[model samples]
Target: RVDVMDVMNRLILAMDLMNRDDALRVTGEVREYIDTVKIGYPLVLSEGMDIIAEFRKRFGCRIIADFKVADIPETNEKICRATFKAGADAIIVHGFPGADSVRACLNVAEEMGREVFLLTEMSHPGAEMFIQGAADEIARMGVDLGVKNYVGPSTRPERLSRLREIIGQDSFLISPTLRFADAAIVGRSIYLADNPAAAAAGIIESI
Candidate 1:
């Protein structure tokens, strides 16, 4: 089982960097105060696995591949393996795709000694139309599959709170978008600020 305290009370700098320079600068500015760094499709698609290597070489923080893996079982295993090889400590996958997709990644993660965080609910607007009422059910599926970490929508406080109850106390909850969580993933709010480091630090301090 994973220990939430291992990552408690820290900010996770979410990187949507388009280029190497921006990736370096943005990550460098706030890496010290953050617990981990989350790499999204924008940067991964542009730079491939090399960007994950670069971040690992510099900051030495744990990396979360926000790939939101949601494909067939075989494809999900492949993606999870590639991500683990790229130096990610964990990967966030969507539970919306069903238990088989999630279990495939979990199998690979266990084999590789990495972790998987299941996305029970998304924070993005209009998400309710898709997976609103099913967060708990999905979380239960993850638990039944032996998953110990989850991702809930921070933008939706009511859902996030309910998700906590569903996932229970043993599992870790990483909300994408908070203070006092295992780690809160933030991108625009910190990246768009005038002083990025200070902005990131502010979020960290608020925790």
Candidate 2:
């Protein structure tokens, strides 16, 4: 099980570019901070699958494949098979996609006996306008199609809070995470001594 303040959705800004030491440094900082978080496919693409193994070697936890698979059933099945074969700890797919598309993912997981991380809605400024209606649709599909968890927005507190209200806390939601107070120097860890002291001071100051 993985719980985190955020998955470091760098895909929002740029593609994965793990070759750079700077990239690794940033990931290392986040990885160290959000110890429970998984490095996503973007992280893999930038860094490489070896990075996944590398992360696993250092800290054992989940790694998410945020592929948002949407394709013909056969193609989806193939991708699903490939994801599991590639050693993905969890795979994500779009819930708004066709039923067969969703089913292909479900079918592949069942055959492989792996887990699927379904995307119910996204967390962005305009995302709520588009995804709110789709949430119930996706939730129902997961129920009908036999999926386990659905992605929820950690950014959109109102939507997520309401989603929790309607679906109940037990219902699965994968919300995005970010901290306004977070900042890091170009070549340093964000969780530095001064920053940590500030973090704790901020917390105490707030209280």
TM-score, per-candidate, Cα-based: 0.92, 0.65
Best by TM-score: 1
- Local error of candidate 2 at 13, Å? 16
As a TM-score, model 2 comes out at 0.65
Q: After superposition, how far is residue 18 of candidate 2 from its true place, in Å?
A: 4.1
Tens-digit lDDT track of model 1 for 1-207: 346536534567788877878887877787667758888888888877888888989878788999999999999999999999989999999998899999999999989989999988865677778787777889889888988888888776677767777777667777763432456778898877778888977776766
lDDT of each residue in 35-66, candidate 2, tens digit only: 33334566567666666555555555345666
**Model 2: lDDT to the true structure:** 0.56
Error (Å) of candidate 1 at residue 13 is 0.7
